[PDB]
Structures are given as structure tokens and as C-alpha cells.
Amino acid sequence: AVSEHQLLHDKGKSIQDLRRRFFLHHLIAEIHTA
């Protein structure tokens, strides 16, 4: 049920989810230049 401001309000699309794409990648994948 997308909303109106959405899209214009990108903040909400698969960004909160792109995060869950990193979810484990973040808590289990990230080395500041060794």
C-alpha cells in the first residue's frame, strides 16, 4: 500500500531494507582497511 509522499519521500523504500541487506553484512562483514 505505497503512500503518496513516498517516492518523493524515498526515505522508506528498500533503503530501510537495503539496510537489512547489510544487516548481517554490517554486524558480520566490515574491516576498516584491515
Residue at 9: amino acid letter: H
The H or E element that residue 5 is part of is: helix 5-8
**Method by which the coordinates were obtained:** NMR
DSSP 25: H
CB 27 within 8 A of CB 34: no
Residue at 22: amino acid letter: F
User: Distance (Å, rounded) from C-alpha 34 to C-alpha 20?
Assistant: 24
